[PDB]
Design a protein around this ligand. Structure first.
Ligand SMILES: NS(=O)(=O)c1ccc(CNC(=O)COc2ccc3ccc(=O)oc3c2)cc1
Ligand SMILES: [Zn+2]
Length: 257
């Protein structure tokens, strides 16, 4: 099955998922000089005050913090989006060293990690139906750089010891994702895909320009997780990122001048 190793990593995914070579794959490099300011874009509306987190899960490729999406509680709207998108989960991609880890890049710069807050379009009823539509998902991407600690991340970091291996989960209620946002909501946006199999081309990507800072100790704790299950040979969960894909016939639009 697919993963991030030499024998099953991103270069191999097209054999089981031919859409890997498709026309709107993610992530991409964001060339800041070529992205055009679009004055018709609106400010992003991030309404997380009623977010209800439930659980954190190691799925063998990252860890997901899962939310109650049975009602309009935490929603993303505005920006490039039409309609209402419900938060279902967030997760990260990160590197073995601080010089790599993000999926999107900015003028070829790689950040240490990248947070993805995943939302689905409520006009399609459920997540599984949404991923079958070109406007089914909105993913908010936030870069992480290593410097000062992010206080709002520490509750995530301190639970990772309890979900070290694939298939482990832990209760994770009352976590506030507003503590993971940077000050500015300036963003780039383009049409793309899921960055892991099945690589479906259903995502409006919204990537924030301002990164958040996390400490070296915080990201070192990410790198102690395992891709393997309990009792199996230890394979550290590092470098779980897909590299940039061809932009093809797409324009990246900037919300800011
Ligand atoms: N990194 S990202 O872009 O933010 C991102 C990436 C992915 C998701 C949601 N995940 C999925 O859709 C996977 O679904 C699957 C995969 C494999 C099988 C194998 C057998 C089978 O029968 O069912 C399957 C169903 C959300 C956000
Ligand atoms: Zn992701």
């Amino acid at each position: 099955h697919w993963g991030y190793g030499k024998h099953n990593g991103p270069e191999h995914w097209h054999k089981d998922f031919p859409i890997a070579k498709g026309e709107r794959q993610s992530p991409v490099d964001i060339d800041t000089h070529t992205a055009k300011y679009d004055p018709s874009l609106k400010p992003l509306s991030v309404s997380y005050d009623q977010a209800t987190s439930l659980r954190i899960l190691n799925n063998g490729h990252a860890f997901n913090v899962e939310f109650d999406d049975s009602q309009d509680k935490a929603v993303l709207k505005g920006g490039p989006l039409d309609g209402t998108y419900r938060l279902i989960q967030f997760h990260f991609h990160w590197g073995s060293l601080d010089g790599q880890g993000s999926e999107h890049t900015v003028d070829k710069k790689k950040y240490a990690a990248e947070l993805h807050l995943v939302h689905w379009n409520t006009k399609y009823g459920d997540f599984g139906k949404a991923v079958q539509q070109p406007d089914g998902l909105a993913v908010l991407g936030i870069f992480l750089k290593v410097g000062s600690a992010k206080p709002g991340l520490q509750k995530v970091v301190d639970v990772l010891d309890s979900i070290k291996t694939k298939g482990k989960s832990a209760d994770f209620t009352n976590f506030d994702p507003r503590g993971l946002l940077p000050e500015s909501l300036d963003y780039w946006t383009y049409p793309g895909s899921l960055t892991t199999p099945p690589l479906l081309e259903c995502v409006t990507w919204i990537v924030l320009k301002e990164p958040i800072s996390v400490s070296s100790e915080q990201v070192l704790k990410f790198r102690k997780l395992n891709f393997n299950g309990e009792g199996e040979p230890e394979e550290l969960m590092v470098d779980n990122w897909r590299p940039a894909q061809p932009l093809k016939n797409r324009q990246i639009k900037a919300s800011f001048k």
